[PDB]
């Protein structure tokens, strides 16, 4: 039948998860636990096993088929992703589950280390019991975020995943830490008025008491994403500053943090820094899990780069092959370059609704300073002494006098750097025609030397950690 074919792969899924739990339980093996847990296992569990072969009715077959309700409720947790009490909360195509025929296979392998017989479910006290429970939830959450489940299922995730846990450990908190972040993205997507932020805050207190590196990193990045949606600026600003955000973090974590920090910085008139992190973020983000947030980074970033006075290329639009969705941003790119306001104001209002979703709209209005700035910027840098009159004819500014105030303000900001001599009336470039007399070639090299040294210190410590973890746990 249909669940028999995918049965081979369920034993495979169980092999990787069971081991992962095992590792965690013996002291601090933390580094090896987080790489396994996130993009690597997940890309396989969902896509290869369930979707590709077909049969998504192997997910609540995986976390139940014994009839475990667990000593602290998690029976519901398993239902809601798939097979609510009917055939499919998305895709069924299963003739055996725990509400169709109990048992057909054991991914549970008759030992508490993912799942185990009903004897655990009704009551246990074992030290294997928290370890299976935290783990139980990671396995479930994997289909939730990929398939983009919604509704009530989304609302009840939070309850089971935290306020059943307020005591964990470092091993357990790490697993839970990953589960909360995936649910949080699924939550964000629906654009429900029911507070995403509130749960994520409650989860933070538990993260902090165990003092688990992982818990702080995951929650914090999501908490910023939540904050942007509501559009309550002050809290996110403080929260970003508090995040130390560890150097030993998963790839998806790295791309998402830089991305949030960029959104926050862009409105602020810290656009030079915002644009670098946002460009980086797109590259760093994967091909599979990342896709919802990923879209949003490329759309926002095009506006953010303009804010610095960068003129973004056509290759940028064509190459990921999203050019259609990007088409309006493309229009802003043209408008910024020309130096004339009329085209920029018109586009801002017309696409206004579409921009607001992505969270661009607050950044779009800031470009009005930038429309003129980007055009005066090319002209001031290129030439030496040029008249305000040249700037105004080319750019289509109102007056040379108008153009004179505008250049003055920019040199104060210092992203065009010049000194104006309104005698004859030219704007003058800064330039020394030798930078060897100045420290600047040395200072440039020296900065690299600090940046380089950081890589050496990071590498020596990181290198031994996974083989060490493997030694205690025993390797074949």
């Amino acid at each position: 039948p249909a669940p028999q074919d995918v049965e081979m792969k369920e034993e495979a899924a169980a092999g990787s998860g069971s081991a992962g739990e095992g590792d965690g339980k013996a002291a601090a093996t933390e580094h090896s636990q987080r790489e396994l847990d996130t993009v690597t296992l997940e890309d396989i569990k969902e896509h290869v096993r369930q979707l590709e072969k077909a049969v998504s009715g192997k997910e609540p077959r995986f976390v139940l088929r014994a009839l475990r309700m667990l000593p602290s409720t998690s029976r519901r947790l398993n239902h809601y992703v798939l097979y609510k009490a009917v055939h499919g909360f998305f895709t069924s195509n299963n003739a055996t589950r725990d509400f169709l025929l109990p048992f057909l296979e054991e991914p549970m392998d008759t030992e508490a280390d993912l799942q185990f017989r009903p004897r655990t479910g009704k009551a246990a006290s074992a030290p294997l019991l928290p370890e299976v429970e935290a783990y139980l939830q990671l396995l479930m959450v994997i289909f939730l975020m990929n398939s983009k489940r919604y509704k009530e299922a989304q609302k009840i995730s939070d309850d089971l995943m935290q306020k059943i846990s307020t005591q964990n450990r470092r091993a357990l908190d790490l697993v839970a830490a990953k589960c909360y972040y995936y649910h949080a993205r699924v939550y964000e997507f629906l654009d429900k008025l029911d507070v995403v932020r509130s749960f994520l805050h409650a989860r933070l207190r538990t993260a902090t008491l165990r003092h688990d590196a992982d818990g702080q990193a995951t929650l914090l990045n999501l908490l910023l994403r939540n904050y942007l949606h509501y559009s309550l600026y002050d809290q996110a600003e403080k929260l970003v500053s508090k995040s130390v955000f560890p150097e030993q973090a998963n790839n998806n974590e790295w791309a998402r943090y830089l991305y949030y920090t960029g959104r926050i910085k862009a409105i602020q008139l810290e656009y030079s820094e915002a644009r670098r992190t946002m460009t980086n973020a797109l590259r760093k983000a994967p091909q599979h899990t990342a896709v919802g947030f990923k879209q949003t980074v490329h759309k926002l970033l095009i506006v953010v780069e303009l804010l610095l006075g960068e003129i973004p290329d056509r290759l940028q639009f064509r190459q990921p092959s999203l050019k259609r969705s990007l088409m309006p941003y493309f229009l802003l790119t043209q408008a910024v370059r020309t130096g004339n306001l009329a085209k920029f104001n018109q586009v801002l209002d017309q696409f206004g609704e579409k921009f607001q979703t992505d969270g661009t709209y607050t950044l779009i209005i800031r470009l009005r300073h930038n429309v003129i700035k980007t055009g005066v910027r090319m002209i001031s840098l290129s030439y030496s002494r040029i008249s305000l009159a040249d700037i105004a004819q080319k750019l289509q500014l109102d007056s040379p006098e108008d153009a004179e105030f505008i250049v003055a303000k920019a040199i104060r900001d210092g992203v065009i750097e010049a000194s104006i001599n309104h005698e004859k009336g030219y704007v003058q470039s800064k330039e020394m025609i030798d930078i060897y007399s100045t420290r600047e070639p040395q200072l440039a090299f020296h900065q690299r030397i600090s940046f380089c040294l950081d890589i050496h210190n990071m590498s020596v410590k990181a290198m031994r950690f996974p083989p060490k973890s493997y030694n205690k746990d025993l390797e074949s």
Binding site: I311, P312, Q334
Partner: peptide, 24 residues
């Protein structure tokens, strides 16, 4: 984005012949 130079090709060849006389 697209280079303004292309549009410039047709305009630049013609300009050359006139300009030399017009201005020193």
């Amino acid at each position: 984005n697209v280079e303004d130079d292309f549009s410039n090709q047709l305009r630049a060849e013609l300009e050359k012949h006139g300009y030399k006389m017009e201005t020193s």
